[PDB]
From Swiss-Prot, chain A:
Pathway: Protein modification; protein sumoylation. The gene is UBE2I. This is SUMO-conjugating enzyme UBC9. Residues 13-18 are annotated as: Interaction with SUMO1. The record marks 100-101 as: Substrate binding. Its main location: nucleus. The keyword DNA-binding does not apply. SUPFAM superfamilies: UBC-like. One of its GO terms (molecular function) is transcription coregulator binding.
UniProtKB/Swiss-Prot annotation, chain B:
Phosphorylation occurs before nuclear envelope breakdown and continues throughout mitosis. Phosphorylated by the M-phase kinase cyclin B/Cdk1, in vitro. Differential timimg of dephosphorylation occurs during phases of mitosis. The phosphorylated form remains associated with RANBP2/NUP358 and the SUMO E2-conjugating enzyme, UBE2I, on nuclear pore complex (NPC) diassembly and during mitosis. Sumoylated. Sumoylation is necessary for targeting to the nuclear envelope (NE), and for association with mitotic spindles and kinetochores during mitosis. Also required for interaction with RANBP2 and is mediated by UBE2I. Desumoylated by HINT1. It is found in: Cytoplasm; Nucleus, Nucleoplasm; Nucleus envelope; Chromosome, Centromere, Kinetochore. The modification Phosphoserine is found at residues 5, 12. The modification Phosphothreonine is found at residue 6. The modification N6-acetyllysine is found at residue 94. Highly expressed in brain, thymus and testis. GTPase activator for RAN. Converts cytoplasmic GTP-bound RAN to GDP-bound RAN, which is essential for RAN-mediated nuclear import and export. Mediates dissociation of cargo from nuclear export complexes containing XPO1, RAN and RANBP2 after nuclear export. It comes from Homo sapiens. This is Ran GTPase-activating protein 1. The record marks 132, 135 as: Hydrophobic interaction with UBE2I. A motif (SUMO conjugation) lies at residues 93-96. Changing residue 94 to R: Loss of cross-link to SUMO1. Abolishes association with nuclear pores during interphase, and with mitotic spindles during mitosis. There is a cross-link at residue 94 (Glycyl lysine isopeptide (Lys-Gly) (interchain with G-Cter in SUMO1)). Homodimer. Interacts with RAN. Forms a complex with RANBP2/NUP358, NXF1 and NXT1. Forms a tight complex in association with RANBP2/NUP358 and UBE2I/UBC9, the ubiquitin-conjugating enzyme E2. Interacts with UBE2I; the interaction conjugates SUMO1 to RANGAP1, and subsequently stabilizes interactions of sumoylated RANGAP1 with RANBP2/NUP358. The complex composed of RANBP2, SUMO1, RANGAP1 and UBE2I associates with nuclear pore complexes. Identified in a complex composed of RAN, RANBP2, sumoylated RANGAP1, UBE2I and XPO1. Identified in a complex composed of RAN, RANGAP1 and RANBP1.
Length: 157, 157
């Protein structure tokens, strides 16, 4: 019973195709039979210019639940990224991505992606999801920035 | 005479001692150290009965050393996963899954203080442990004494 989620996702797809930030990618995956799987989207976030993430194209998957948009979509970087707020599994979280926090119907895919992009260069040090990136970020910012640049190059188109 | 399963089910200083003078070997022998999550559980259950008293302190420390030596000695055991799950269970690092909330952090902190000084402990983990033990947290604040000791020890690693 995901008809309600599918009706919205179909409109979000059209809206995204009509207008979305340059460099960003958000497309539903395909089912084995060739039809669209609107519950599972393949996305890509370009590093923000002027930052150490520049030049990189970071891929992530957006998974929607049958009760969407009551619940937020689950976002996971594939592969997992070196970042304080990116879990080892690649899962990335934001206040607007938490049902019990700032998630709400007014939230769009464009908002989520831009929100995650902003997070990449401006980590949330109070709520890390990874111990490794958080540790280096706090103990040696220069080294942290270095790891980020290398990662940005590795993920350049 | 008591058994490991009963001790782990309902840990108590007395039950640990009732395991016998070989309790340390028994805890490790009966624990599936191939599974990081299981090692974390065993470690927390054992450390939860720590008391600043001769017999109990020795029993907990020896049990921890036997368990963690066995776990870390396997070239396959992922020490980083152990650390990550340990922090999650201690309520110091967020996670996707739901975990029980540990009441007293005194035992776990004092057990770690001892562990980080042993030869079997991978030094690469010290910086991460320190970053999360120094990070603001209500639970750690209530156990300042243990917290300060562990940090002072981590500084010397």
């Amino acid at each position: 019973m995901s008809g309600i989620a599918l009706s919205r996702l179909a409109q979000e797809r059209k809206a995204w195709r009509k207008d979305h930030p340059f460099g960003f990618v958000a497309v539903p995956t395909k089912n084995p039979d060739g039809t669209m799987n609107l519950m599972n989207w393949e996305c890509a976030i370009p590093g923000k210019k002027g930052t150490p993430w520049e030049g990189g194209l970071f891929k992530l998957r957006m998974l929607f639940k049958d009760d969407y948009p009551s619940s937020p979509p689950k976002c996971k970087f594939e592969p997992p990224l070196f970042h304080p707020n990116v879990a080892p599994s690649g899962t990335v979280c934001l206040s607007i991505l938490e049902e019990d926090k700032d998630w709400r119907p007014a939230i769009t895919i464009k908002q989520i992606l831009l929100g995650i992009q902003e997070l990449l260069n401006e980590p949330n040090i109070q709520d890390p999801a990874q111990a490794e990136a958080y540790t280096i970020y706090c103990q040696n910012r220069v080294e942290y920035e270095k790891r980020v640049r290398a990662q940005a190059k590795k993920f350049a188109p | 005479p008591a058994d490991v399963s009963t001790f782990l089910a309902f840990p108590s200083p007395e039950k640990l001692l009732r395991l016998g003078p070989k309790s340390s070997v028994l805890i490790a022998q009966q624990t599936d150290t191939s599974d990081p999550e299981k090692v974390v559980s065993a470690f927390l259950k054992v450390s939860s009965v720590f008391k600043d008293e001769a017999t109990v302190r020795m029993a907990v420390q020896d049990a921890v050393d036997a368990l963690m030596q066995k776990a870390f000695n396997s070239s396959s055991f992922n020490s980083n996963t152990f650390l990550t799950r340990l922090l999650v269970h201690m309520g110091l690092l967020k996670s996707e899954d739901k975990v029980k909330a540990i009441a007293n952090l005194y035992g776990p902190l004092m057990a770690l203080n001892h562990m980080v000084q042993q030869d079997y402990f991978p030094k690469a983990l010290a910086p991460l442990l320190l970053a999360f033990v120094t990070k603001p947290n209500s639970a750690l604040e209530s156990c300042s004494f243990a917290r300060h000791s562990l940090l002072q020890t981590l500084y010397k690693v």
